[PDB]
Amino acid sequence: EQTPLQEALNQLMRQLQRKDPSAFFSFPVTDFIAPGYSMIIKHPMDFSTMKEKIKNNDYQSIEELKDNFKLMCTNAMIYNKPETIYYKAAKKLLHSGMKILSQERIQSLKQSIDFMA
């Protein structure tokens, strides 16, 4: 059984992943797919890793998941040049995810989570 915070994080994750229908961010980036990635990107992140962190009750707050989501998108904007499909998709996903992870949602969920304690 999961905590209200875990369930809230999973609901947000489901909406975030629907904004990545091409699965650009589903799985960790490998060096054979992205040569030098592990030397360039100091803190890799992907949706599957975020999902495991929710399951393992690693997140203390929605803001921590939001930071991880931003990190995943900006990593792709560092490794890929601005003209590329992957940079443009990362920037668009970042923009869409910031609406999904809005302060108004976070504030609403904080109250509900607190009330259910």
Side-chain angles (χ1 to χ4, degrees), residues 5-26:
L5 176 58
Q6 277 174 298
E7 287 181 335
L9 297 172
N10 274 323
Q11 293 283 355
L12 292 164
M13 187 71 57
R14 300 211 316 248
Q15 304 193 9
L16 292 174
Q17 277 211 279
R18 283 202 298 267
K19 296 302 181 180
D20 179 31
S22 301
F24 285 172
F25 300 92
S26 298

PDB file of all heavy atoms in Angstrom, residues 5-26:
ATOM      1  N   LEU A   5       1.198  10.814  -0.589  1.00  0.00           N
ATOM      2  CA  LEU A   5       2.221  11.491  -1.384  1.00  0.00           C
ATOM      3  C   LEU A   5       2.656  10.626  -2.557  1.00  0.00           C
ATOM      4  O   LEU A   5       2.772  11.116  -3.682  1.00  0.00           O
ATOM      5  CB  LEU A   5       3.425  11.859  -0.522  1.00  0.00           C
ATOM      6  CG  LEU A   5       4.594  12.499  -1.283  1.00  0.00           C
ATOM      7  CD1 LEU A   5       4.161  13.777  -2.007  1.00  0.00           C
ATOM      8  CD2 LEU A   5       5.752  12.795  -0.337  1.00  0.00           C
ATOM      9  N   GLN A   6       2.873   9.333  -2.326  1.00  0.00           N
ATOM     10  CA  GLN A   6       3.249   8.449  -3.429  1.00  0.00           C
ATOM     11  C   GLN A   6       2.189   8.448  -4.523  1.00  0.00           C
ATOM     12  O   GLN A   6       2.505   8.520  -5.715  1.00  0.00           O
ATOM     13  CB  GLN A   6       3.466   7.031  -2.913  1.00  0.00           C
ATOM     14  CG  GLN A   6       4.824   6.766  -2.322  1.00  0.00           C
ATOM     15  CD  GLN A   6       4.891   5.376  -1.714  1.00  0.00           C
ATOM     16  OE1 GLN A   6       4.154   5.070  -0.773  1.00  0.00           O
ATOM     17  NE2 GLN A   6       5.760   4.516  -2.260  1.00  0.00           N
ATOM     18  N   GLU A   7       0.915   8.341  -4.134  1.00  0.00           N
ATOM     19  CA  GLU A   7      -0.140   8.290  -5.139  1.00  0.00           C
ATOM     20  C   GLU A   7      -0.222   9.596  -5.917  1.00  0.00           C
ATOM     21  O   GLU A   7      -0.422   9.587  -7.138  1.00  0.00           O
ATOM     22  CB  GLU A   7      -1.468   7.944  -4.474  1.00  0.00           C
ATOM     23  CG  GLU A   7      -1.490   6.476  -4.053  1.00  0.00           C
ATOM     24  CD  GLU A   7      -2.789   6.037  -3.413  1.00  0.00           C
ATOM     25  OE1 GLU A   7      -3.518   6.890  -2.858  1.00  0.00           O
ATOM     26  OE2 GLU A   7      -3.071   4.819  -3.466  1.00  0.00           O
ATOM     27  N   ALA A   8      -0.055  10.730  -5.229  1.00  0.00           N
ATOM     28  CA  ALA A   8      -0.018  12.014  -5.923  1.00  0.00           C
ATOM     29  C   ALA A   8       1.129  12.062  -6.919  1.00  0.00           C
ATOM     30  O   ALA A   8       0.963  12.533  -8.054  1.00  0.00           O
ATOM     31  CB  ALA A   8       0.117  13.149  -4.914  1.00  0.00           C
ATOM     32  N   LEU A   9       2.309  11.594  -6.510  1.00  0.00           N
ATOM     33  CA  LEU A   9       3.450  11.625  -7.424  1.00  0.00           C
ATOM     34  C   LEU A   9       3.193  10.756  -8.654  1.00  0.00           C
ATOM     35  O   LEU A   9       3.535  11.146  -9.779  1.00  0.00           O
ATOM     36  CB  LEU A   9       4.721  11.189  -6.693  1.00  0.00           C
ATOM     37  CG  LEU A   9       5.154  12.092  -5.532  1.00  0.00           C
ATOM     38  CD1 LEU A   9       6.301  11.468  -4.747  1.00  0.00           C
ATOM     39  CD2 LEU A   9       5.538  13.476  -6.035  1.00  0.00           C
ATOM     40  N   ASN A  10       2.580   9.586  -8.463  1.00  0.00           N
ATOM     41  CA  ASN A  10       2.287   8.699  -9.592  1.00  0.00           C
ATOM     42  C   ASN A  10       1.279   9.328 -10.545  1.00  0.00           C
ATOM     43  O   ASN A  10       1.410   9.184 -11.765  1.00  0.00           O
ATOM     44  CB  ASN A  10       1.763   7.347  -9.103  1.00  0.00           C
ATOM     45  CG  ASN A  10       2.869   6.375  -8.787  1.00  0.00           C
ATOM     46  OD1 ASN A  10       3.897   6.340  -9.472  1.00  0.00           O
ATOM     47  ND2 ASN A  10       2.676   5.581  -7.743  1.00  0.00           N
ATOM     48  N   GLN A  11       0.264  10.021 -10.011  1.00  0.00           N
ATOM     49  CA  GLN A  11      -0.711  10.681 -10.878  1.00  0.00           C
ATOM     50  C   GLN A  11      -0.045  11.751 -11.729  1.00  0.00           C
ATOM     51  O   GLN A  11      -0.366  11.905 -12.915  1.00  0.00           O
ATOM     52  CB  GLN A  11      -1.833  11.310 -10.054  1.00  0.00           C
ATOM     53  CG  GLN A  11      -2.719  10.288  -9.347  1.00  0.00           C
ATOM     54  CD  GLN A  11      -3.717   9.597 -10.278  1.00  0.00           C
ATOM     55  OE1 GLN A  11      -3.831   9.939 -11.455  1.00  0.00           O
ATOM     56  NE2 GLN A  11      -4.443   8.612  -9.745  1.00  0.00           N
ATOM     57  N   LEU A  12       0.864  12.513 -11.128  1.00  0.00           N
ATOM     58  CA  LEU A  12       1.598  13.523 -11.880  1.00  0.00           C
ATOM     59  C   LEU A  12       2.496  12.873 -12.919  1.00  0.00           C
ATOM     60  O   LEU A  12       2.571  13.336 -14.062  1.00  0.00           O
ATOM     61  CB  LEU A  12       2.416  14.380 -10.922  1.00  0.00           C
ATOM     62  CG  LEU A  12       1.582  15.279 -10.002  1.00  0.00           C
ATOM     63  CD1 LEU A  12       2.448  15.761  -8.871  1.00  0.00           C
ATOM     64  CD2 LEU A  12       0.992  16.467 -10.775  1.00  0.00           C
ATOM     65  N   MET A  13       3.177  11.792 -12.538  1.00  0.00           N
ATOM     66  CA  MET A  13       4.043  11.076 -13.475  1.00  0.00           C
ATOM     67  C   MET A  13       3.264  10.587 -14.693  1.00  0.00           C
ATOM     68  O   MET A  13       3.753  10.676 -15.824  1.00  0.00           O
ATOM     69  CB  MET A  13       4.722   9.904 -12.759  1.00  0.00           C
ATOM     70  CG  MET A  13       5.780   9.190 -13.573  1.00  0.00           C
ATOM     71  SD  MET A  13       7.236  10.229 -13.753  1.00  0.00           S
ATOM     72  CE  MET A  13       7.661  10.543 -12.055  1.00  0.00           C
ATOM     73  N   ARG A  14       2.046  10.067 -14.488  1.00  0.00           N
ATOM     74  CA  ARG A  14       1.255   9.579 -15.618  1.00  0.00           C
ATOM     75  C   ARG A  14       0.951  10.702 -16.604  1.00  0.00           C
ATOM     76  O   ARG A  14       0.992  10.494 -17.825  1.00  0.00           O
ATOM     77  CB  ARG A  14      -0.043   8.924 -15.131  1.00  0.00           C
ATOM     78  CG  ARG A  14       0.167   7.717 -14.206  1.00  0.00           C
ATOM     79  CD  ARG A  14      -0.944   6.660 -14.328  1.00  0.00           C
ATOM     80  NE  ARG A  14      -2.282   7.246 -14.358  1.00  0.00           N
ATOM     81  CZ  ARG A  14      -3.190   7.112 -13.393  1.00  0.00           C
ATOM     82  NH1 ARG A  14      -2.915   6.402 -12.302  1.00  0.00           N
ATOM     83  NH2 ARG A  14      -4.379   7.685 -13.518  1.00  0.00           N
ATOM     84  N   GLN A  15       0.667  11.904 -16.096  1.00  0.00           N
ATOM     85  CA  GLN A  15       0.391  13.030 -16.981  1.00  0.00           C
ATOM     86  C   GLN A  15       1.658  13.513 -17.669  1.00  0.00           C
ATOM     87  O   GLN A  15       1.622  13.882 -18.851  1.00  0.00           O
ATOM     88  CB  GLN A  15      -0.261  14.166 -16.200  1.00  0.00           C
ATOM     89  CG  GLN A  15      -1.517  13.707 -15.486  1.00  0.00           C
ATOM     90  CD  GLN A  15      -2.341  14.858 -14.967  1.00  0.00           C
ATOM     91  OE1 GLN A  15      -2.068  16.023 -15.269  1.00  0.00           O
ATOM     92  NE2 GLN A  15      -3.364  14.540 -14.184  1.00  0.00           N
ATOM     93  N   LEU A  16       2.788  13.502 -16.951  1.00  0.00           N
ATOM     94  CA  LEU A  16       4.059  13.886 -17.566  1.00  0.00           C
ATOM     95  C   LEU A  16       4.426  12.937 -18.696  1.00  0.00           C
ATOM     96  O   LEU A  16       4.870  13.373 -19.767  1.00  0.00           O
ATOM     97  CB  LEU A  16       5.177  13.901 -16.521  1.00  0.00           C
ATOM     98  CG  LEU A  16       5.124  14.974 -15.436  1.00  0.00           C
ATOM     99  CD1 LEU A  16       6.230  14.737 -14.406  1.00  0.00           C
ATOM    100  CD2 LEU A  16       5.273  16.337 -16.072  1.00  0.00           C
ATOM    101  N   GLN A  17       4.256  11.633 -18.477  1.00  0.00           N
ATOM    102  CA  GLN A  17       4.700  10.683 -19.489  1.00  0.00           C
ATOM    103  C   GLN A  17       3.818  10.726 -20.727  1.00  0.00           C
ATOM    104  O   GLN A  17       4.273  10.367 -21.819  1.00  0.00           O
ATOM    105  CB  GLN A  17       4.735   9.271 -18.911  1.00  0.00           C
ATOM    106  CG  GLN A  17       5.999   8.972 -18.158  1.00  0.00           C
ATOM    107  CD  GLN A  17       6.399   7.515 -18.244  1.00  0.00           C
ATOM    108  OE1 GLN A  17       5.867   6.687 -17.516  1.00  0.00           O
ATOM    109  NE2 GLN A  17       7.353   7.197 -19.121  1.00  0.00           N
ATOM    110  N   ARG A  18       2.558  11.131 -20.586  1.00  0.00           N
ATOM    111  CA  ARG A  18       1.709  11.262 -21.763  1.00  0.00           C
ATOM    112  C   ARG A  18       2.214  12.350 -22.687  1.00  0.00           C
ATOM    113  O   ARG A  18       1.893  12.336 -23.878  1.00  0.00           O
ATOM    114  CB  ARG A  18       0.262  11.557 -21.368  1.00  0.00           C
ATOM    115  CG  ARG A  18      -0.498  10.349 -20.856  1.00  0.00           C
ATOM    116  CD  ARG A  18      -2.005  10.538 -20.985  1.00  0.00           C
ATOM    117  NE  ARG A  18      -2.497  11.659 -20.188  1.00  0.00           N
ATOM    118  CZ  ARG A  18      -2.966  11.547 -18.949  1.00  0.00           C
ATOM    119  NH1 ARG A  18      -3.006  10.361 -18.357  1.00  0.00           N
ATOM    120  NH2 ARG A  18      -3.395  12.622 -18.300  1.00  0.00           N
ATOM    121  N   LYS A  19       3.003  13.282 -22.165  1.00  0.00           N
ATOM    122  CA  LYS A  19       3.616  14.315 -22.991  1.00  0.00           C
ATOM    123  C   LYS A  19       4.895  13.848 -23.688  1.00  0.00           C
ATOM    124  O   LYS A  19       5.553  14.660 -24.344  1.00  0.00           O
ATOM    125  CB  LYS A  19       3.897  15.553 -22.139  1.00  0.00           C
ATOM    126  CG  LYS A  19       2.628  16.208 -21.597  1.00  0.00           C
ATOM    127  CD  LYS A  19       1.682  16.622 -22.722  1.00  0.00           C
ATOM    128  CE  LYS A  19       0.427  17.303 -22.166  1.00  0.00           C
ATOM    129  NZ  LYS A  19      -0.517  17.727 -23.239  1.00  0.00           N
ATOM    130  N   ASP A  20       5.253  12.572 -23.566  1.00  0.00           N
ATOM    131  CA  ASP A  20       6.434  11.999 -24.218  1.00  0.00           C
ATOM    132  C   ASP A  20       6.017  10.773 -25.026  1.00  0.00           C
ATOM    133  O   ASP A  20       6.501   9.660 -24.789  1.00  0.00           O
ATOM    134  CB  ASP A  20       7.490  11.636 -23.171  1.00  0.00           C
ATOM    135  CG  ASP A  20       8.751  11.006 -23.776  1.00  0.00           C
ATOM    136  OD1 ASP A  20       9.101  11.343 -24.934  1.00  0.00           O
ATOM    137  OD2 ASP A  20       9.390  10.174 -23.078  1.00  0.00           O
ATOM    138  N   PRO A  21       5.093  10.928 -25.980  1.00  0.00           N
ATOM    139  CA  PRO A  21       4.623   9.742 -26.718  1.00  0.00           C
ATOM    140  C   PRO A  21       5.713   9.040 -27.520  1.00  0.00           C
ATOM    141  O   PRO A  21       5.558   7.847 -27.810  1.00  0.00           O
ATOM    142  CB  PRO A  21       3.529  10.306 -27.633  1.00  0.00           C
ATOM    143  CG  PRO A  21       3.889  11.725 -27.810  1.00  0.00           C
ATOM    144  CD  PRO A  21       4.455  12.156 -26.485  1.00  0.00           C
ATOM    145  N   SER A  22       6.803   9.722 -27.882  1.00  0.00           N
ATOM    146  CA  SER A  22       7.899   9.073 -28.605  1.00  0.00           C
ATOM    147  C   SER A  22       8.854   8.313 -27.688  1.00  0.00           C
ATOM    148  O   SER A  22       9.812   7.708 -28.186  1.00  0.00           O
ATOM    149  CB  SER A  22       8.688  10.102 -29.419  1.00  0.00           C
ATOM    150  OG  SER A  22       7.851  10.761 -30.352  1.00  0.00           O
ATOM    151  N   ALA A  23       8.621   8.335 -26.373  1.00  0.00           N
ATOM    152  CA  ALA A  23       9.435   7.605 -25.399  1.00  0.00           C
ATOM    153  C   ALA A  23      10.887   8.076 -25.406  1.00  0.00           C
ATOM    154  O   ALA A  23      11.811   7.287 -25.178  1.00  0.00           O
ATOM    155  CB  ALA A  23       9.358   6.087 -25.628  1.00  0.00           C
ATOM    156  N   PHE A  24      11.105   9.367 -25.682  1.00  0.00           N
ATOM    157  CA  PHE A  24      12.462   9.902 -25.661  1.00  0.00           C
ATOM    158  C   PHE A  24      13.078   9.796 -24.276  1.00  0.00           C
ATOM    159  O   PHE A  24      14.300   9.686 -24.145  1.00  0.00           O
ATOM    160  CB  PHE A  24      12.478  11.380 -26.089  1.00  0.00           C
ATOM    161  CG  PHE A  24      12.301  11.613 -27.559  1.00  0.00           C
ATOM    162  CD1 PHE A  24      12.140  12.901 -28.043  1.00  0.00           C
ATOM    163  CD2 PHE A  24      12.294  10.567 -28.458  1.00  0.00           C
ATOM    164  CE1 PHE A  24      11.980  13.139 -29.396  1.00  0.00           C
ATOM    165  CE2 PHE A  24      12.131  10.800 -29.813  1.00  0.00           C
ATOM    166  CZ  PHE A  24      11.975  12.087 -30.280  1.00  0.00           C
ATOM    167  N   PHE A  25      12.255   9.837 -23.231  1.00  0.00           N
ATOM    168  CA  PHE A  25      12.741   9.925 -21.862  1.00  0.00           C
ATOM    169  C   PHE A  25      12.322   8.726 -21.014  1.00  0.00           C
ATOM    170  O   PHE A  25      12.388   8.786 -19.780  1.00  0.00           O
ATOM    171  CB  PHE A  25      12.259  11.232 -21.228  1.00  0.00           C
ATOM    172  CG  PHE A  25      12.731  12.458 -21.955  1.00  0.00           C
ATOM    173  CD1 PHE A  25      11.958  13.030 -22.956  1.00  0.00           C
ATOM    174  CD2 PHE A  25      13.955  13.023 -21.656  1.00  0.00           C
ATOM    175  CE1 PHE A  25      12.403  14.156 -23.646  1.00  0.00           C
ATOM    176  CE2 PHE A  25      14.396  14.153 -22.333  1.00  0.00           C
ATOM    177  CZ  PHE A  25      13.622  14.705 -23.331  1.00  0.00           C
ATOM    178  N   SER A  26      11.903   7.625 -21.647  1.00  0.00           N
ATOM    179  CA  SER A  26      11.397   6.496 -20.873  1.00  0.00           C
ATOM    180  C   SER A  26      12.491   5.815 -20.063  1.00  0.00           C
ATOM    181  O   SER A  26      12.240   5.370 -18.937  1.00  0.00           O
ATOM    182  CB  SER A  26      10.713   5.479 -21.790  1.00  0.00           C
ATOM    183  OG  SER A  26       9.593   6.051 -22.439  1.00  0.00           O
TER     184      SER A  26
END
